[PDB]
């Protein structure tokens, strides 16, 4: 209730969706209370960090609604670059029918110049669906803290928090 760790989301890449959040220990400092002159510092330096990870959670991503959705549309998660580059041809479409079958074999074009180009879009045919593709994981679920562990038994708790969990049913 008073001293919890900031929760850290565990990942599975090809699915795109994160498994669930967990506490940090292999870098967690000594909690053997040093004295009355440093207890306020070890609880104080952490306290401003709790607001560092709280403020950016609303900035980096829109606040939590569906905590872990597999059926995920693209809005903040970016759809890849939509820009095509189109170039012309050394030979023409209609200036070739006159020669080869008649007699003269063929081997801007320096015979009869023409300018004709057509540009078509490069974008992903229809919008991005499912999990995160390349690298948008940190921008989607930033490490966030629940500072009062399981405060509220039967109504709701940290739900999608568990790695052994799917969105369809609990347990």
């Amino acid at each position: 209730k008073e001293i919890p760790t900031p929760y850290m989301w565990s990942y599975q890449p090809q699915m795109g969706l994160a498994a669930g959040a967990a506490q940090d220990y292999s870098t967690r400092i000594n909690y053997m209370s040093a004295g009355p002159h440093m207890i306020s510092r070890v609880n104080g330096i952490r306290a401003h960090r709790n607001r560092i990870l709280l403020e950016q959670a609303a900035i980096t991503t829109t606040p939590r609604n569906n905590l872990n959705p597999r059926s995920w549309p693209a809005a903040l998660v970016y759809q890849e670059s939509p820009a095509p580059t189109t170039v012309v041809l050394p030979r023409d479409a209609q200036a070739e029918v006159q020669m080869t079958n008649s007699g003269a074999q063929l081997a801007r074009p320096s015979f009869t110049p023409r300018q004709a180009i057509l540009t078509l879009q490069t974008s992903s045919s229809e919008p991005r669906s499912g999990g995160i593709g390349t690298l948008q994981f940190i921008e989607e679920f930033v490490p966030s803290v629940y500072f009062n562990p399981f405060s509220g038994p039967p109504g709701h708790y940290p739900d999608q928090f568990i790695p052994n969990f799917d969105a369809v049913k609990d347990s």
Binding site: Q12, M15, P163, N164, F165, D166, K169
Partner: protein
Amino acid sequence: TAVDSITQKKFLCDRTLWRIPFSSNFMSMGALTDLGQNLLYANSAHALDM
């Protein structure tokens, strides 16, 4: 004639590939199989002994 006998029942499997679906429903349909990627089956590395 009458000489008492008992039948042996061995089978023969040739070229056939030992097929099995990775499902609780036992159905081989799609890349994302029924029990292959379920509730807790895309889970982290656990020890296997068969």
